[PDB]
Design a protein around this ligand. Structure first.
Ligand SMILES: NC(=O)c1ccc[n+]([C@@H]2O[C@H](COP(=O)([O-])OP(=O)(O)OC[C@H]3O[C@@H](n4cnc5c(N)ncnc54)[C@H](O)[C@@H]3O)[C@@H](O)[C@H]2O)c1
Length: 277
């Protein structure tokens, strides 16, 4: 059993899902079929991942009822302009072989291109047309968010950003809570870019519950109310990552993990929105 959370638009989303980022396209179908089998229902993909087909194929292969699944895809940086958003989403839909997706995201803000507002406008139209159930963004900074909302009056259901113990983007998460936008933690486990599992706050919490560090970290995101979809191809980790609704961390435990953030942005492991396209 994976609990769901409710969006500002009333739609619900499973709090834990399976992200297929990094999964080679030729292997995505197996990977998803396995997650599916494991009990995963929320699939996180993206057009840029070039593996929507595999996901779609996996879905179809599973006997699974459409309504029981949560499918997320994202709008690539080069499709912000004109009616490209509608073209991009249609392509995605065709790959997934779905009528519509559950959630659709503006992959990156590409501020320098100053087309993220236009993208947002088009996104709204996509939802209106029923191409997607909900809409959100990704990698959007506070100013990005203010601007889109100001321009449209429509608030993203979510903001998918890089988030883990060493790099929390508190300003964003704070803004989100104030605006009722849910947070999707990408790279929830640091992408192996640093010794997260070695962190003492992490080991203390895991040990304190008879869980793994990965599990404890996952629990922290969850408890903080964020949405997670860690990547993994090992069934051992799949099952493991699913086994986190069984327990809960103490406030003290959470607080200790929260202290891991240097507060200077030095804990970042991936690309910054001001730098991507
Ligand atoms: N919005 C964006 O720009 C963006 C960027 C990156 C990823 N995403 C999404 O977020 C998902 C998760 O992030 P990620 O995969 O980049 O990094 P991550 O923090 O999930 O780290 C992934 C790595 O952790 C390992 N992992 C998973 N479970 C583990 C466990 N129990 N024990 C040990 N290792 C374990 C995997 O082997 C994998 O190599 C992706 O699948 C993708 O769908 C979105």
């Amino acid at each position: 059993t994976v609990p769901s959370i409710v969006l500002n638009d009333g739609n619900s989303i499973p709090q834990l899902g399976y992200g297929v980022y990094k999964v080679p396209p030729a292997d995505t179908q197996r990977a998803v079929e396995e997650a599916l089998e494991v009990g995963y229902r929320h699939i996180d993909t993206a057009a840029i991942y070039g593996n929507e087909e595999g996901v779609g194929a996996a879905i179809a292969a599973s006997g699974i009822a459409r309504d029981d699944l949560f499918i997320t895809t994202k709008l690539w940086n080069d499709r912000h302009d004109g009616d490209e958003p509608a073209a991009a989403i249609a392509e995605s839909l065709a790959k997934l072989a779905l009528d519509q997706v559950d959630l659709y995201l503006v992959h990156w803000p590409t501020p320098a291109a100053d087309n993220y507002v236009h993208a947002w406008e088009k996104m709204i139209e996509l939802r209106a047309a029923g191409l997607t159930r909900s809409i959100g963004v990704s990698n959007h900074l506070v100013p990005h968010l203010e601007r889109i909302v100001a321009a449209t009056g429509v608030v993203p259901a979510v903001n998918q950003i890089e988030l883990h113990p060493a790099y929390q983007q508190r300003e964003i998460t704070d803004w989100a809570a104030a605006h009722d936008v849910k947070i999707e933690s990408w790279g929830p486990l640091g992408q192996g870019k640093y010794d997260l599992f070695g962190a003492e706050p992490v080991t203390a919490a895991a040990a304190a519950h008879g869980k793994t560090p990965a599990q404890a970290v996952l629990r922290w995101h969850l408890q903080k109310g964020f949405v997670v979809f860690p990547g993994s191809v090992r069934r051992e980790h799949l099952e493991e990552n699913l086994d986190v609704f069984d327990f809960d961390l103490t406030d003290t435990e959470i607080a200790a993990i929260d202290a891991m953030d240097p507060g200077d942005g030095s804990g970042r492991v991936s690309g910054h929105p001001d730098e991507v396209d």
